[PDB]
């Protein structure tokens, strides 16, 4: 199948003082591999699944010099957003920021992103073309022109297409067992008595990897978003994905509903229904 | 691995 | 514009100096080189942001600190043993974009 | 990354015309060239960061090769006063520039 590697930061003001919080983290797919806590005792990129761990020195004092490099740069941008916005010093503020790059299954690039938020809002992104950008807002614009002007978006898309997608290829190759594994589901149907002419039909999928799934719900018949509740994705701790789908059904008619999950671990889709 | 290069807003 | 004073410097072998190297023009970025007659360019130091630097490719014997934007200034230590040569520093509005020089310093060790 | 100059030296006679080198095994987001002066910094001369694109200054022609790895200078019937080393760089990916060792140019009456 397709995959993917991703960066994510988060940079927090705390003033009165003092210091800025900064996380990194970075994922393989689900799987996350580094991090970075500016609160740690360590003040160094450090390994989170075991693949990464056979890593030369080399490569963690390159990640971890580099990765603090970061985090200096937005020191400097949460000092210049409360300039660009006039908000005083009092506010604790956020910046969040998200790159990486999406190969297919021939593992040659297909995507790559460069977003930021301010505040949990869109603030300036790369588009899907790596070469020019959506400012959200009128403090985003003097951020795109500053970029403009000093040809930002064409070194990225050098980063995204070339040197991205080789580490995510030695990546996917250092953890074969882990990286590649696919998991169908487990599949099965609670049915509850919630009212009395009325009944809960519940569809469940557990230990299922990657996280990506589609649980849809139909009578008879088809799709219904017509009273149809979700739970998101959440992590089972093991490394696999839960979810459930939920229907309420006039009680006597638990028959004319189908639950369908596609999967990349299911050769094609499962459809179950309600059994007695 | 992340960019080796940093560039302010 | 960027400057760096002075032009011409002399000092004795066993002594520390710093070279001055400040700029206006709001560059985020900072660099070092020396330069040896009829020879190239070659990167002792150079700084990304203020708080943050990093060492080139002939780094052993030389310091820097960037504590402000707008300067950067260069310590030759007892290094190695060939510290005589045209200092040049630039500087860019980002990391990795075009760099604009400084008018160089001449430093000359004596024995 | 590595950005090769070539020639080392070119010595010619004023009035005649010349091309220098800047070559890359790999892709360069942008690039610059430099002349210095003897005791003096490196006046930057232009940047290019479409493949493909032309830009002139003086009697300098500058051009990026189309696949973004190499760049070429041109000088149209040069003068004694284009005696200069001229000197390449390019976008490095750790926050530099990525210089090319210069090629010496010496334009005689």
């Known amino acids: 199948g397709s995959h993917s590697m991703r960066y994510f930061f988060t940079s927090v003001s705390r003033p009165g003082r003092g210091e800025p919080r900064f996380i990194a983290v970075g994922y393989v797919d689900d799987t996350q591999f580094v991090r970075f806590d500016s609160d740690a005792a360590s003040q160094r990129m450090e390994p989170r699944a075991p693949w990464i761990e056979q890593e030369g020195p080399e490569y963690w004092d390159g990640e971890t010099r580099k990765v603090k490099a970061h985090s200096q740069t937005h020191r400097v941008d949460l000092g210049t957003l409360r300039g660009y916005y006039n908000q005083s010093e009092a506010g604790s503020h956020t910046v969040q920021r998200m790159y990486g790059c999406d190969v297919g299954s021939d593992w040659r690039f297909l995507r790559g992103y460069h977003q930021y938020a301010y505040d949990g809002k869109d603030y300036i992104a790369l588009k899907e073309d790596l070469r020019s950008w959506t400012a959200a807002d009128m403090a985003a614009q003097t951020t795109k022109h500053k970029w403009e002007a000093a040809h930002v978006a064409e070194q990225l898309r050098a980063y995204l297409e070339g040197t991205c997608v080789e580490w995510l290829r030695r990546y996917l190759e250092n953890g074969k067992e882990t990286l590649q594994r696919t998991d169908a589901p487990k599949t099965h149907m609670t049915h509850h008595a919630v009212s009395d002419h009325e009944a809960t039909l519940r569809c469940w999928a557990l230990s299922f990897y990657p996280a990506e799934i589609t649980l849809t719900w139909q009578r008879d018949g088809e799709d219904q978003t017509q009273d149809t509740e979700l739970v998101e994705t959440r992590p089972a701790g093991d490394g696999t994905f839960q979810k459930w789908a939920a229907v309420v059904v006039p009680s006597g008619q638990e028959q004319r509903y189908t639950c369908h999950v596609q999967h990349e671990g299911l050769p094609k889709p499962l459809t179950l229904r309600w059994e007695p | 691995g992340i960019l080796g290069f940093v560039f302010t807003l | 514009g960027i400057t760096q004073s002075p032009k011409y410097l002399f000092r004795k072998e066993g002594q520390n100096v710093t070279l001055s190297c400040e700029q206006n023009?709001?560059?985020?970025?900072m660099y070092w080189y020396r330069q040896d007659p009829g020879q190239g360019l070659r990167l002792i130091y150079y700084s990304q942001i203020v708080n943050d630097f990093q060492k080139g490719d002939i780094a052993e014997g030389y310091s820097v600190s960037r504590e402000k934007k707008e300067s950067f200034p260069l310590t030759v230590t007892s290094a190695q043993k060939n510290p005589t040569a045209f200092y040049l520093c630039?500087?860019?509005?980002?990391?990795?974009?075009?760099?604009?020089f400084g008018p160089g310093t001449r430093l000359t060790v004596t024995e | 990354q590595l950005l090769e100059q070539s020639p080392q030296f070119l010595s010619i006679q004023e009035g005649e015309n010349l091309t220098v080198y800047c070559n890359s095994s790999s892709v360069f987001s942008s690039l610059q060239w430099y002349r210095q002066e003897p005791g003096e910094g490196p006046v930057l001369l232009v940047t290019?960061?479409?493949?493909?694109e032309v830009k002139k200054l003086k009697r300098l022609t500058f051009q990026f090769g189309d696949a973004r790895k190499d760049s070429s200078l041109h000088i149209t019937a040069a003068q004694p006063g284009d005696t200069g080393l001229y000197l390449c760089?390019?976008?490095?990916?750790?926050?530099?520039?990525?210089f090319g060792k210069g090629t010496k140019l010496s334009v005689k009456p």
């Open positions: 760089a390019g976008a490095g990916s750790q926050g530099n520039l990525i």
């Open positions: 290019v960061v479409t493949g493909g």
């Open positions: 023009l709001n560059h985020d970025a």
């Open positions: 630039a500087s860019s509005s980002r990391s990795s974009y075009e760099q604009y």
